[PDB]
């Protein structure tokens, strides 16, 4: 298992995201998060806050360049079908922050998954208004394709997620 840790981004791929969540102990519902630092400088993971569900792992605090982190998000103990939602923030080498959250519902054909990623010049965490500015702002619903949009005036986020309970979630930060 490699969930709740950091590894070389040069070796981080979809097969690795699956391997991590597989060896962890995948329950009824779960995810696989990976944010690849390819900008050019060292980052600092602020903290992680579990809004709904529970998780057997812990997010790192330091993420140097050329390396990515690993995280996950399950539905409670397993036999309980509440939800799986959490939010976290990552301090870039330049002093900016990038908000990141996940939302996994219970109902396959009666709900959908949600997530938001943006890079803004400042310091913020998932407390109340920050998590809302992501969830209620504009989620990407897990459109099952590579989504990327120039917004950092030079770099941006490039990621994919599906509209399923067991979705993968990678974020490839590049120029």
Swiss-Prot record:
Chain span(s) of sequence motif Cell attachment site, crucial for protein stability: 141-143
Ranges where the record places region Trp-rich region, which is important for the binding to lipid membrane: 103-118
Cellular component GO terms, alphabetical: extracellular region; nematocyst; other organism cell membrane; pore complex
UniProt region (Plays an important role in the hemolytic activity), positions on chain: 1-10
Superkingdom of this protein's organism: Eukaryota
Region spans: N-terminal region: 9-28
Site description Important in the initial contact with the lipid membrane, residues in chain: 110-111
A biological-process GO annotation: monoatomic cation transport
Stated consequence of mutating residue 19 to E: Reduction of hemolytic activity
Binding residues annotated for phosphocholine, in chain numbering: 52, 85, 103, 105, 131, 135-136
Expressing tissues: Expressed in tentacles and mesenteric filaments.
Keyword annotations from UniProtKB, A to Z: Cytolysis, Ion transport, Membrane, Nematocyst, Secreted, Target cell membrane, Target membrane, Toxin, Transmembrane, Transport
Regions crossing the membrane: none
Notes concerning its domains: Composed of a long N-terminal alpha-helix and a core region rich in beta-sheet structures. Before the pore formation, the alpha-helix binds the lipid membrane, partitions into the lipid-water interface and stabilizes the monomeric molecule on the membrane. Finally, it traverses the bilayer, thus forming the transmembrane pore.
Subunit structure: Octamer or nonamer in membranes. Monomer in the soluble state. Originally described as forming tetramer in the presence of a lipidic interface.
Family: Belongs to the actinoporin family. Sea anemone subfamily.
Function: Pore-forming protein that forms cations-selective hydrophilic pores of around 1 nm and causes cardiac stimulation and cytolysis. Pore formation is a multi-step process that involves specific recognition of membrane sphingomyelin (but neither cholesterol nor phosphatidylcholine) using aromatic rich region and adjacent phosphocholine (POC) binding site, firm binding to the membrane (mainly driven by hydrophobic interactions) accompanied by the transfer of the N-terminal region to the lipid-water interface and finally pore formation after oligomerization of monomers.
Protein's recorded name: DELTA-stichotoxin-She4b
Species per Swiss-Prot/TrEMBL record: Stichodactyla helianthus
